[PDB]
């Protein structure tokens, strides 16, 4: 059967009984840093069972006329376990992830989600002169919602969150060039994505630079007849892979 | 004192030239290369991925996510029409802005086949068959199911495998076709009709939606790189 997976990382395990395939990045599996491309000159810390495991983020409700969500994945993990304690005592660090969005419904519901993973998603502000503040770009493991109307220019520092432009200025239909999967409630129940380290420097700081973005956008909205269960939640389960850090200092 | 003789074309600045030129920083040392994932070697790798097509514009949906969804009901008659658009991937406003039309509008000629993947985004107990036709030009639009069955078609049954792929072939007199609208090199029409109904059980919603994707086959090609009309400037930024 091509419909069952079993992923094992560290001391955790994800079981699935109704899935699609597994989309692997840009054809690349995450590996450690080689000796050709390294630029730092002291021995890195590789915990590799303390950090590489499945951290489960918070749940969000899929309402009947909803818009979308985004987590800012690089430091979505910042307050989770021993991934968030090496992120502070160190200066550098590289990672790759294994994102597993899971949302289930019966055989009488209908809908469709798009689960992308957008590297370097620079967001636009509502007021044209300013740039959005930190609290509006990323919430610490809490989803930030899109809006099916548009945000006016009276708001000084807020992200422009119209869904049909995806907040970056591009069309929302063309987001299928990034590695992506659909959660069609007719056939699918979850979506797996294995992302390598995509950046222009061999190691980057973990608090000033969010090098991904995970967006869930419902292209076909939820619907059900009167009687079915109206609360359909969505859970994201992110796990780092082949994590290493460098340059120890005080706590920040 | 070698005798030379300067031809026409001397001391001109052509923007698409290929010459050498003295370096402004001698004996520089570049920063060594790194294996960043996801390298583009050719622009026809970008125009061979699927992108969602706004088949449902109608002036109220283009400022929404409703523009991508094609509405499909449960009817009381047979042979109705679901959608229809002409196959002009550079000038028709349906395929104007997808990932294929944003690349063809940099070039002038194009040649090849085009895939069209539909996906039934409905309930798990809804059934039905659709006919996906494509009629080459010469006559008008097909207006019946009898007039559209005579072209190129494929009858799609909705089951466990949700999606079905209509592959529009390359039938043309010339070796290329213009990106801009021209009636000398028109390409045809793509329609879609109910074969049978959409039959649902009790307590299942009847209004189901259908998405549509577009891409290019392994023999698509472009020519004569030009400028794009989808951008505009007044002063500097």
């Amino acid at each position, epitope marked *: 059967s091509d419909r069952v997976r079993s992923i094992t990382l560290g001391n955790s395990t994800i079981t699935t009984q109704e899935c699609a395939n597994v989309v692997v990045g840009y054809g690349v599996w995450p590996e450690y840093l080689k000796d050709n491309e390294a630029t730092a000159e002291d021995q890195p810390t590789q915990p590799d069972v303390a950090t590489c495991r499945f951290y489960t983020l918070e749940s969000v409700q899929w309402m009947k006329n909803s818009a979308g969500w985004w987590w800012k994945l690089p430091d979505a993990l910042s307050q989770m376990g021993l991934f968030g304690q090496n992120m502070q005592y160190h200066y550098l660090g590289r990672t790759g992830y294994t994102i597993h969005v899971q949302c289930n419904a019966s055989k009488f519901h209908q809908g469709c989600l798009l689960v992308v993973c957008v590297p370097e998603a620079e967001m636009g502000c509502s007021n044209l002169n300013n740039t959005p503040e930190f609290s509006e770009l990323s919430g610490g493991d809490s989803a930030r919602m899109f809006t099916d*109307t548009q945000v006016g220019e009276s708001n000084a520092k807020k992200v422009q969150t119209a869904v049909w432009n995806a907040g970056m200025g591009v069309g929302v239909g063309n987001l299928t060039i990034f590695p992506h999967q659909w959660i069609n409630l007719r056939t699918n129940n979850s979506a797996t994505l294995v992302m390598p380290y995509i950046n222009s420097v061999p190691m980057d700081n973990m608090f000033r630079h969010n090098n991904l973005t995970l967006m869930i956008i419902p292209f076909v909205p939820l619907n059900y007849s009167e009687g079915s269960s109206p609360y359909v939640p969505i859970t994201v389960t992110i796990a780092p892979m082949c994590a290493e850090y460098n340059g120890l200092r005080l706590a920040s | 004192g070698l005798p030379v003789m300067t031809t026409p074309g001397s001391t001109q600045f052509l923007t698409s030239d290929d010459f050498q030129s003295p370096s402004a920083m001698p004996q520089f040392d570049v920063t060594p290369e790194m294996q960043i994932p996801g390298r583009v070697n050719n622009l026809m790798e970008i125009a061979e991925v699927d992108s969602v097509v706004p088949v449902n514009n109608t*002036e*109220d949906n283009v400022s*929404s996510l409703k523009a991508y969804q094609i509405p499909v009901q449960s009817n009381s008659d047979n042979g109705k029409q679901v959608f229809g658009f002409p196959l002009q991937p550079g000038a028709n406003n349906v395929l104007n802005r997808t990932l294929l039309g944003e690349i063809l509008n940099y070039y002038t000629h194009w040649s090849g086949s085009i895939k069209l993947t539909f996906m039934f985004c409905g309930s798990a107990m809804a059934t039905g068959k659709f006919l996906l036709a494509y009629s080459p030009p010469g006559a008008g639009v097909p207006k019946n199911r009898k007039d559209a069955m005579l072209g190129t078609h494929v009858i799609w049954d909705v089951g466990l495998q949700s999606s079905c792929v209509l592959c529009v072939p390359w039938i043309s007199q010339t070796h290329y076709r213009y990106v801009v609208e021209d009636e000398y090199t028109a390409a045809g029409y793509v329609t879609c009709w109910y074969q049978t109904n959409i039959v649902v059980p009790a307590d299942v919603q009847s209004s189901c939606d259908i998405l549509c994707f577009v891409s290019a086959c392994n023999d698509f090609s472009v020519r004569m790189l030009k400028d794009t009309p989808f951008i505009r400037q007044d002063t500097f930024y």
Partner: antibody
Amino acid sequence: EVKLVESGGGLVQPGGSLSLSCAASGFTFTDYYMNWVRQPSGKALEWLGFLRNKANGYTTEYSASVKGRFTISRDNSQSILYLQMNALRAEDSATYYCARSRYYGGTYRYALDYWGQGTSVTVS
Amino acid sequence: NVLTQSPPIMSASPGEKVTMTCRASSSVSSSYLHWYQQKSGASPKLWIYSTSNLASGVPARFSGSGSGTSYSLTISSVEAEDAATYYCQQFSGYPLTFGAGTKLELK
């Protein structure tokens, strides 16, 4: 049937505050956008701001002239909607309405279908 | 974006066909222009949404049209029931501006 009754208007001094309240009945309060429109005596209608539904996150969006002085919010338990007015001037004497919005197709056209009866504020 | 309605006051006898307008300074989308009717001393009411679609319970005599920056409302037969003031609404950017008003005076 939709039934919107608002209350809380009256005489007030310039430089003072006043809180209007609009109560909703007949529909689910967490599904629809809720607007606030005022109208001076025999003049044009003026839009003050709305407050989005639960699925878009209850954010607000004010006008250009009342931004920072007025505040739109609701109560968590029962179906009611507020408006807190601050630093009132002489031109704020008008009739204040409480309008509803809805989705017509699947999208959101910006109409205001069901209106309230209108409360009055006189500032002098 | 300021809406300008013309005429400010108008008069028509029952049985006539009368047409008012609402012209914007910049182009609005056709799905964002709406028409309202406020009678004398009462709360307003939605009349036409998205420039050609009739609201609920409205008579079939009213019909709006137009596109671009010129929009219009057309009454085929005037009765004594529709003597009121008609506003037009828009949206191109925030805020949503209402029109001045066209008062229908019965003859």
